Amino acid sequence: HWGYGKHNGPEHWHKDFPIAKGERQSPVDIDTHTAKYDPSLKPLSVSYDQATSLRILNNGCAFNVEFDDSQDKAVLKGGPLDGTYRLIQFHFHWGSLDGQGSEHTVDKKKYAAELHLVHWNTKYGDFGKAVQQPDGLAVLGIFLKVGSAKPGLQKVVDVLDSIKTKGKSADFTNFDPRGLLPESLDYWTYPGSLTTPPLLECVTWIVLKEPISVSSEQVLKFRKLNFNGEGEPEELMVDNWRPAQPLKNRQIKASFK
Ligand SMILES: *SCCNC(=O)CC(c1ccccc1)c1ccccc1
Ligand SMILES: [Zn+2]
């Protein structure tokens, strides 16, 4: 029932999901002049060399690339995190225009899109249990800007034709998410939530400072997806992003000076 339109978008979510007006909601604006370098933060470890993707799905909200998380194949460790967090999936949020689309902002700047690499804490055994824990998830957020094409994204872009509408999925094996990372692993980190209902406050956010560049043609293909299901009237999948929420009683820490 919730969505991203005028009668059911983010300003309405609180009626079915009162936690939307919560104490640690995401996304937020990242005030780079207020975030503090934290020297306690240990180095970030992104270990994706044995990653195993399975499938890509249009769920009506975005598209997810799903991974085999039955073992420690692609994991996130270090930084602010205690323990190992398993890659379960990734997705994007993007806009109708290159001037908007990200969820997090940097000094109020909106990027063209935002990549979320979603990982869960292995100490809680599965994702569904992890989301009911304040330290259950770790999401790696990577901003997208429009410029030169991102070669590691092209495999993703090409399959989208086969998952145009809500409920469609396709085989997506042997995709390597290392091709979606920037050079630098400099990040900001804060405690927050999922950015769609149920909006659970179970996330440790890790947002890379360095955006990746994608081409105009690549993001235009994202914009051709549909929110609707097959044989329903076309509603382009665009602007599936939730805006910045109140930081309230939280501190954003930086991994770099
Ligand atoms: S079209 C709805 C899209 N959202 C889902 O993928 C739901 C999913 C979730 C959350 C809480 C419990 C079970 C499943 C999810 C949402 C955001 C990030 C990761 C997973
Ligand atoms: Zn997301």
Side-chain angles (χ1 to χ4, degrees), residues 1-5 7-41 43-81 83-128 130-160 162-167 169-256:
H1 184 66
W2 67 266
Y4 292 97
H7 299 280
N8 65 348
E11 270 11 305
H12 287 112
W13 293 355
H14 74 98
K15 285 181 278 163
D16 291 306
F17 303 102
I19 199 200
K21 283 164 158 66
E23 294 305 310
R24 65 178 266 198
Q25 287 291 287
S26 296
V28 300
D29 184 50
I30 308 177
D31 186 309
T32 62
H33 301 100
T34 304
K36 192 170 186 203
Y37 168 79
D38 184 350
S40 44
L41 295 171
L44 184 63
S45 194
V46 186
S47 306
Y48 287 169
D49 56 287
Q50 295 309 149
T52 311
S53 60
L54 307 168
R55 174 186 88 142
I56 183 169
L57 170 76
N58 178 339
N59 59 22
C61 304
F63 61 81
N64 299 349
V65 183
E66 298 150 3
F67 288 78
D68 176 10
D69 64 344
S70 69
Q71 318 177 62
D72 279 353
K73 264 151 144 83
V75 306
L76 192 60
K77 306 182 179 154
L81 306 172
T84 141
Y85 287 69
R86 243 170 240 178
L87 189 59
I88 181 155
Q89 45 95 125
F90 69 74
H91 61 267
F92 302 81
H93 308 265
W94 62 91
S96 54
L97 298 170
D98 297 346
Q100 66 190 54
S102 67
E103 302 210 302
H104 292 92
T105 51
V106 185
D107 294 332
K108 298 297 171 91
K109 176 188 168 80
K110 303 171 149 113
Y111 284 90
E114 188 172 327
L115 168 61
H116 291 163
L117 296 121
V118 182
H119 310 76
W120 52 277
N121 190 339
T122 58
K123 85 202 249 184
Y124 295 122
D126 63 59
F127 176 90
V131 292
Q132 296 166 62
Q133 316 306 321
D135 55 351
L137 294 195
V139 185
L140 191 57
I142 310 186
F143 294 118
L144 283 56
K145 76 164 171 86
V146 174
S148 73
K150 191 66 167 177
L153 171 68
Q154 187 63 32
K155 269 186 243 248
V156 170
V157 156
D158 278 334
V159 76
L160 293 181
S162 76
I163 60 155
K164 187 197 219 177
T165 51
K166 178 174 66 247
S169 67
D171 175 295
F172 206 63
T173 59
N174 298 288
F175 183 75
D176 174 1
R178 286 173 305 178
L180 310 161
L181 303 184
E183 298 195 349
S184 194
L185 292 174
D186 294 355
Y187 68 86
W188 301 282
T189 187
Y190 77 102
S193 77
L194 306 171
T195 64
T196 55
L199 296 168
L200 304 176
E201 290 176 338
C202 61
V203 182
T204 293
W205 278 97
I206 300 170
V207 178
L208 299 189
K209 169 197 74 196
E210 170 169 22
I212 52 162
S213 295
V214 305
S215 61
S216 217
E217 288 90 349
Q218 281 177 322
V219 64
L220 279 155
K221 316 227 175 158
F222 286 19
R223 297 192 186 115
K224 263 147 156 219
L225 289 170
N226 282 187
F227 280 129
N228 55 287
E230 182 182 5
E232 309 193 326
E234 187 163 22
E235 251 319 85
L236 293 183
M237 182 173 280
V238 295
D239 286 318
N240 55 356
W241 50 276
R242 170 195 208 201
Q245 305 297 312
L247 186 62
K248 294 160 153 155
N249 190 229
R250 299 177 282 178
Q251 252 173 195
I252 304 173
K253 295 313 198 175
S255 91
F256 61 98

